[PDB]
Design a binder for this molecule. Structure first.
Ligand SMILES: O=C(NO)[C@H](O)[C@H](O)COP(=O)(O)O
Ligand SMILES: O=C(NO)[C@H](O)[C@H](O)COP(=O)(O)O
Lengths: 213, 217
């Protein structure tokens, strides 16, 4: 009901895709009975220090880099934990840092440097120190049709938009520390020209338009 | 405009440590600077045993958001939290363990209330490994035996401060960040302290104090 302000589910996806093509961010909500959380998403292709700074200012600050299994393997990033027993099996790899061009790794600029370094299609494992202050996530093969996570949503959006299949995500957080919920996510999107969409929107879009990716 | 001149208003090095200990006993935060030729960063530090949702929320608002839990090696061991990486090649060998979530009493783990729950669960000296799920959204750090007299890091400074204050040896830390995303330096750290009632001290302050009054912790 609140989401209708951003259009019908297909329109909501199209507007998100176009925002990403224009180098802008989007807000992605998962199922209400899952995390019921909204994440800011940026395309790595066009990622700027300003965008990263905004993400740190407005979100959890635990900025994650969503990668394909193939890119994660290229980087030799094993899962952070052999036996993952997190509630949602969040696919955290070992954390990373650019080995060149950063200092402590935590500044907005430094995180962008690390992210650009990792997402590079010609990247090598030795391009990244471990541990670091950027947190890669392995997207499941099949994307949101196989796992209904923001992780898959991020990589799927990039692929659907024709962009570098790597994106950054972080959870929108209210000033008092509680997580933004649907009305706050809607308001944020309207205030800051960021399309809002849901995982279910993406699932319907992909099935409807026969998008194999 | 050197650091010692700027910091003088917080008192002499010994006064600066004594004020930080007092703040922690009163359940307030402190701001800890490491060496200017090291990270040259200021971290907010809180004691775990008095940690509140509001304190955590401030860290999320104003710091990197990668909020770390400084633990003794014994505590990390009882939680089954070895180093995240066998062969750590990060710039200053930051002793990250794998990340953690409370097994019970949290949802996604990332809210201020959830992080506090996870941190208090992890810092409990009777905790068992099954009390935590991995990976998570709280990042534990293994402090070096010997504290700042073994490693001049915020990690050690955090645990040493709790011990010197007579609190349980667990604290949380996060790096203060400027609104433009850059990391806060001594002038901005000083202003933040005076805005948020946090005393400011340095690792060198701590080292000099321990050498004079607390060689063994
Ligand atoms: O918890 C996370 N990051 O720390 C998650 O990657 C993000 O918030 C949502 O992840 P998921 O929806 O793919 O499980
Ligand atoms: O990078 C970190 N945490 O993410 C460090 O724990 C924090 O910046 C201070 O670490 P230090 O113990 O090397 O001074």
């Amino acid at each position: 009901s609140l989401l209708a302000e951003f259009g019908d589910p297909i329109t909501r996806v199209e507007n998100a895709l176009q925002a990403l093509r224009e180098g802008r961010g989007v807000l992605l909500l998962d199922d209400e009975d899952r995390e019921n959380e909204g994440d800011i998403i940026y395309a790595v292709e066009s990622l700027t220090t300003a965008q990263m700074a905004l993400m740190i200012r407005e979100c959890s600050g635990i900025v994650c880099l969503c990668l394909t299994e193939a890119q994660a393997d290229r980087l030799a990033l094993p899962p952070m934990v052999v036996n993952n027993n997190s509630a949602n099996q969040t696919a955290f790899t070992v954390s990373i840092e650019a080995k060149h061009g950063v200092t402590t790794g935590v500044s907005a600029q430094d995180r962008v440097t690390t992210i650009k370094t990792a997402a590079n299609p010609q990247a090598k494992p030795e391009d990244l120190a471990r541990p670091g202050h950027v947190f890669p996530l392995r997207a499941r093969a099949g994307g949101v049709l196989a796992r209904r996570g923001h992780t898959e949503g991020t990589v799927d959006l990039m692929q659907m938009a024709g962009l570098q299949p790597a994106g950054v995500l972080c959870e929108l957080t209210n000033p008092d520390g509680s997580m933004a919920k649907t009305p706050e996510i809607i308001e944020f999107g309207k205030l800051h020209n960021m399309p809002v969409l849901t995982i279910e929107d993406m699932v319907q879009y992909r099935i409807q338009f026969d998008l194999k990716l």
